[PDB]
A = this chain, B = another copy of it.
Amino acid sequence: QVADLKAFSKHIYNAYLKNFNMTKKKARSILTGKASHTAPFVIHDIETLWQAEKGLVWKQLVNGLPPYKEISVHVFYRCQCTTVETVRELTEFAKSIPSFSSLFLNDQVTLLKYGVHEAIFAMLASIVNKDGLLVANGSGFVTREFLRSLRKPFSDIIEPKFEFAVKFNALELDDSDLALFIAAIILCGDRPGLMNVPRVEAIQDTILRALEFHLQANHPDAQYLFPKLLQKMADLRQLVTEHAQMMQRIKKTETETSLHPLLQEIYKDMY
């Protein structure tokens, strides 16, 4: 409609504000320039990361890169705990979605398991910059260069996500649209092992229609809307595909570094 659909693209919006502490507009906030309200402790190297492990208080020993675990692997490790924490908000997000909680628990898991990462790599863009990423609830800011300065296996597992973030932030979206662009990716019927495909697909459509008129209310000046946003939903389906591969290679040669159980469950079917 034009209101019931206006209240739908709104409800999901509150579900997106009450489940994600770091919103794009609250992140774009820090990454300003003439802002001293919040100055993020920049990393760029092993020294700043070490003290960051103190100045930004991270419960996991004042660092964590001995002759068993190293710098690189400790970042990857740090990377997965945030992810695991974001998978958590997404779950609480999707559950706040209307007909989502309608689905049987098994289907809710299938949707998350397969779309929780495409969604997260999409929000990544919200806290990104051409020169770095926001970490530690806005208090940190790990430079992009620093991350490319990581070991061989790792290091190249975060750069493509930047390549995407750059472009994806060129569409100039805002939290309102993101709330809908996320719920759309989670409510994806093309997910493997989905039980009530017709149902999911139906909720999807109303999502994409909600996102439809909404890109009309807020943004009235382009064409990014859908052919670009929808194409980016596909672009994300590959980023995840390439990401699941490095992950499988890491698990196959990085016998030293562990993988969070939850993340091991998510992977093991994708290809």
Q: Which residues of A are in contact with B by a Cβ distance under 8 Å?
A: 1-6, 34, 36-41, 139
Please determine whether A3 and B40 come into contact, CB atoms closer than 8 angstroms: yes
Given contacts A1-B34, A4-B34, 12 further A-B contacts (CB under 8 A): A1-B36, A1-B37, A1-B39, A2-B37, A2-B38, A2-B39, A3-B34, A3-B37, A3-B38, A3-B41, A4-B39, A6-B39
For this chain, the copies found in one complex come to: 2
16 inter-chain pairs at a CB distance below 8 angstroms, sorted by A residue, are: A1-B34, A1-B36, A1-B37, A1-B39, A2-B37, A2-B38, A2-B39, A2-B139, A3-B34, A3-B39, A3-B40, A3-B41, A4-B34, A4-B37, A5-B39, A6-B39
Q: Is the interface of A mostly helix, strand, loop or mixed?
A: loop
Most B-side CB within 10 Å, residue of A3, A4, A5: A3
CA distance A2 to B6 in the complex (A): 38
> What chain B residues lie within 8 Å of A139 (beta carbons)?
2
> What chain B residues lie within 8 Å of A37 (beta carbons)?
1-4
In angstroms, how far is the closest chain B Cβ from the Cβ of A44? 15
> What chain B residues lie within 8 Å of A39 (beta carbons)?
1-6
> What chain B residues lie within 8 Å of A6 (beta carbons)?
39
> What chain B residues lie within 8 Å of A3 (beta carbons)?
34, 37-41
Beta-carbon nearest neighbor of A139 in chain B: B2
5 interchain residue pairs of minimum CB distance: A3-B39, A2-B38, A1-B37, A4-B39, A1-B39
CA distance A41 to B1 in the complex (A): 12
CA distance A4 to B36 in the complex (A): 9
Beta-carbon nearest neighbor of A138 in chain B: B2
In angstroms, how far is the closest chain B Cβ from the Cβ of A38? 4
In angstroms, how far is the closest chain B Cβ from the Cβ of A34? 5
8 Å CB contact of A1 from B2, B5, B38: B38
